[PDB]
Amino acid sequence: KAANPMREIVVKKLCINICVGESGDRLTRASKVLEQLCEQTPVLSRARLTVRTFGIRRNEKIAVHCTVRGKKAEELLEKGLKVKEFELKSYNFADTGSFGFGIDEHIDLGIKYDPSTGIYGMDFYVVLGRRGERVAHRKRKCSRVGHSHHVTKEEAMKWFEKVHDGIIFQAKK
Amino acid sequence: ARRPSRCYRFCKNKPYPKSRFCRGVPDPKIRNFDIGRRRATVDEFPVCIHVVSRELEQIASEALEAARIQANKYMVKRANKDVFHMRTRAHPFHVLRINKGMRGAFGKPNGVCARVRIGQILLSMRTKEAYVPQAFEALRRAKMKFPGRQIIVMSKYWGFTNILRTEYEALRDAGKLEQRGTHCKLIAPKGKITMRNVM
Amino acid sequence: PFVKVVKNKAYFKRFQVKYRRRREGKTDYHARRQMVLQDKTKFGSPKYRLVVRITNKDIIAQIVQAKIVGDEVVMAAYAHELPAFGIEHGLTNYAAAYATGLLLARRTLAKLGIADKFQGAKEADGSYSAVRTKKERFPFKAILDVGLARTTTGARVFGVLKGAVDGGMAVPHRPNRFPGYNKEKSSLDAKVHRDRIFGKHVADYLKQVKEEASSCVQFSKYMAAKVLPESIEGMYKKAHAAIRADPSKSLPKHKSYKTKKLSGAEKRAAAKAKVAAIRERL
Amino acid sequence: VHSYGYKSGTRHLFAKKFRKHGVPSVSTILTNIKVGDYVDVVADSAVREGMPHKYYHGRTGIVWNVTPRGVGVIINKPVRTRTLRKRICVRFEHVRKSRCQEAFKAKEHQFQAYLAAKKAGKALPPLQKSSRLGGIVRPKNVEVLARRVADYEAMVPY
RNA sequence: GGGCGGCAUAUCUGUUACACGACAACGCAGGUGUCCUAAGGCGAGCUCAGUGGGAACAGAAAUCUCACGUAGAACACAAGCGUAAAAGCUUGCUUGAUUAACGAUUUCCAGUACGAAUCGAGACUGCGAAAGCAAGGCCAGCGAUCCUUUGCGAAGAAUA
RNA sequence: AUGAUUAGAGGCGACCUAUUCUCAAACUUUAAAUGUGCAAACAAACCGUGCCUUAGCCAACUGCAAGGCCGGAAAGAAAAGAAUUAGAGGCACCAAGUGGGCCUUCUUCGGUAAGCGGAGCAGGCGAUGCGGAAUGAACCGC
RNA sequence: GAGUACGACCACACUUGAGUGAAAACACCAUAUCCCGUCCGAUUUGUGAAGUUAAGCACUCACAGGCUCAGUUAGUACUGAGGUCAGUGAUGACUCGGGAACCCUGAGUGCCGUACUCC
Ligand SMILES: [K+]
Ligand SMILES: [K+]
Ligand SMILES: [K+]
Ligand SMILES: [Mg+2]
Ligand SMILES: [Mg+2]
Ligand SMILES: [Mg+2]
Ligand SMILES: [Mg+2]
Ligand SMILES: [Mg+2]
Ligand SMILES: [Mg+2]
Ligand SMILES: [Mg+2]
Ligand SMILES: [Mg+2]
Ligand SMILES: [Mg+2]
Ligand SMILES: [Mg+2]
Ligand SMILES: [Mg+2]
Ligand SMILES: [Mg+2]
Ligand SMILES: [Mg+2]
């Protein structure tokens, strides 16, 4: 039964990622920007493997990211999609029901641009789901979510264009 | 030059393949194991002729290559190259060594050979009923290149398949056979009922 | 295509399914093997676990002996049996956990016949006194079995443990996980632990939620009844007294719904009918 | 083997069977071993503590010592012209109760039950009769055993 | 033959090796004389290698996210074996790598020693709510007589 | 599965999925034959709210563990193919030669091979003639 | 006839699709003052009962894949013992015994305890 209220799609979380790529002053400023944006403490993400072309090395903090849930996540998504002018492409949606977009100007999100920091730009990713995804993340009796209960790409697109009234492009690449 | 093959007959050692323990093995002499119209469908060549070894022995890749070349030359000379398909079954996976009785006499790889058993098919040729004597004479001349004793027989199966010649046409007409390249599989009443296995 | 299928025929051929309870996410078998373990020099003398399991709605406390045929439950107590003693709401809070542990200890000691010999603490103080174990007659001993629960400072599993200890049973423990224990100071605040045991935290939250209500999912059944935040502690005290007075009481006291299995003959007949129908179509 | 370490030549001996990996079960923990019991010394590959030497794998002996986590087993070992009673010390995971006296114990119990029935006057179970005896044979279906041409035609492959 | 070469001179893994154990060659393929206050001990969390879907710069490869993933990764170092709510990875606390009354065993074996290892009994401990686990890093990594050298036999008390 | 390996087929050439030709001392799901431990009633094992002791275990004992004591029953090990024995078992003491081995069935490694070098199980010769293979340490018989 | 907690054996129990599920459970679920822990009450911890069987869970099905037990493969392969057996040999068969494996095909798709609860 699709009409069951437990099948309503909700925003599980909004994940904001700023990949500065080099530790030091830039990463500190990026963490401050994320602290201003998300109203909560972010975390530095350490490099996995040394890549010469990017520098990077290993175990070195190269990015700062944060997870936002609840009302703050929804308002942040509203701001980010307002910046994107409520237009997302078809391939921006994953087959797992999630979608995301990049923002190039941190000062475009209604945030003061006092020159103590600079313009960074970031990554917005939102994860859709339904009430019941606890079964695959709880410690006891952990089990797979039912196949039908998953959020599909078409379901995510319909949720986006019904809730936020956005426009899909139906293009590729 | 190369040693006489009488030194490397008789399968005296445990199998000694090329691996991470035996490095430095030269490539086998025989490279392509199919000649003739290898892309011909299973229905095109109903007659299968075997060269069956009657001895437990080793056959060098040089002998295998020479036999395949001789058989191909005869088949293309006394027939067409599109009316047969011969397959070399034995593969040279056993490495021969040369101590080039002294101390530290364990040798280096100098060749490769196929270890062959009694009743093992060495060469199989798919062909038509018109060119059967040509196939027999080509396989006789190719046998002349091999060591030991081999017999040439005509298979009771259709081509390279495991389906008998008498029953192949009836099975195919009834729809009981699946064509996958140059061999066929008798479709079984099992699995999900699809447009296949309905029979 | 273009993506290799990991779960192919060979993958299933070589798969070794885990134990049923592990694949159900129920039992930690390393912990269970260490818990049912005993000295081989004991030659199988009886050993008991205090099994504490908490659901979304109930608290399950059992005294269990491990056996090869299957574990034997000596005594069981439930949170939903507390209404027989006077606990009408909040059957899953810390106070209900303490009461369930007390009830299980009293029932076990009554069944073993040593109830009059071991009284435990009549009045709960929240204070820690070390249990008396072998490692005057010794108290009945069980070891705590929290299962997969996260053992934090103030979890209700330790509420059940504390209730059982005050009930008379000797469960070896340290106060490091009781609510109110100060990790930095390495000291226990017995007043805070007693407040949790009698649910003054629940009473304070109820008062706050009611004040906000005047200004309704939370405490809906508490507020539907005429439950006052100032009567909770007396209610739990009376519950303790009643549980000690008579632990044997509980709550006051075959149509087939299964689907029949088709036989193999019926499965094959259905399959043959289906293939015949497909043949008739084509 | 090229070296003579403690676990030399145990690649297949101290390996677990296919799809039977994992640590010993609770039934192994709960087994009660007594001094004087007959046990089988079978090394569990996944324990690696208190492991017997490869020689004692598959040997049956008598328990002479029980410790809190170990078992003392006496194993016969032939050395030159004599057999030595070797005392090995292993953990209980590498020990199994031996059914080597199961049939003898059953024989003793059956003899005791037979004596009890003979005392009670109960009728003893009928004695089994020998299957080696003669008798009349009445064949329901008789077939001819012979060699046919088809047997030869079949034993030839291809 | 010896010599040169090499080390088959002490020793570890797989194989030869013939489904108990044992088995030769200057047989085959490789190791050892180290390294680690953590890479030892314990508790708790977590899951690995890869694979797809997706997300500014960002691409085959930088981070984020969702699934699938029986281990195809890791476990100092050679090789097996073993291990998935771990034995792997992170993190917290620690010194069980200390003593250990001449306890008893296995391996080589003459049933001698050494080196490694196993089951214990004491003392003082560490981690853990607890059951428990731990006197190093499982299995290779090491050394007689004689000689040298270091530690222990504090202070006090006893008419003995 | 891990390693190799041939060719067609169905969804640039790969890629994917079903197969297909051929393999492994240092691969293996499976798996013999020959083996190899233990047991098969006289210092034992079996039975008993049997009794005593314990500074052993268990919350306790009448439960368990251990030494005993007192009784019982004993095909003395039935019947089902249901063992056999030129079957005195144990325990020492003192010493000799020997510590170059060779051959063979079967299994086996190095070597093109060798009346070559090197192993396993077991029989031989050495140490042994006699009767046979004309002749031969070892083959056949004894 | 079922449920829950603890289990024993650890696929006949797993995996993939679908469907059905009385009661009570179990679970999704609501929430963050206190106990506790996180970048994030996601996990975890505390407090609680407005909704839902949509998931989990349990059953049922599939000429399903695996798994289990058989048959067949096959008295074949291999093998203990024997010959002054055959054969130049490679190797074979024979005599007295033992005896496989995959493919392929048939059947089946958890079972057994302790305690409490619903029918
Ligand atoms: K020839
Ligand atoms: K250790
Ligand atoms: K020294
Ligand atoms: Mg010449
Ligand atoms: Mg050889
Ligand atoms: Mg734990
Ligand atoms: Mg081997
Ligand atoms: Mg094995
Ligand atoms: Mg062996
Ligand atoms: Mg752990
Ligand atoms: Mg000593
Ligand atoms: Mg020593
Ligand atoms: Mg060591
Ligand atoms: Mg100690
Ligand atoms: Mg080590
Ligand atoms: Mg150790």
Ligand SMILES: [Mg+2]
């Ligand atoms: Mg008899």
Ligand SMILES: [Mg+2]
């Ligand atoms: Mg001499």
Ligand SMILES: [Mg+2]
């Ligand atoms: Mg010689």
Ligand SMILES: [Mg+2]
């Ligand atoms: Mg002599």
Ligand SMILES: [Mg+2]
């Ligand atoms: Mg003669």
Ligand SMILES: [Mg+2]
């Ligand atoms: Mg939550």
Ligand SMILES: [Mg+2]
């Ligand atoms: Mg919660």
Ligand SMILES: [Mg+2]
């Ligand atoms: Mg449903």
Ligand SMILES: [Mg+2]
């Ligand atoms: Mg099937």
Ligand SMILES: [Mg+2]
């Ligand atoms: Mg034989």
Ligand code: NA
């Ligand atoms: Na010295």
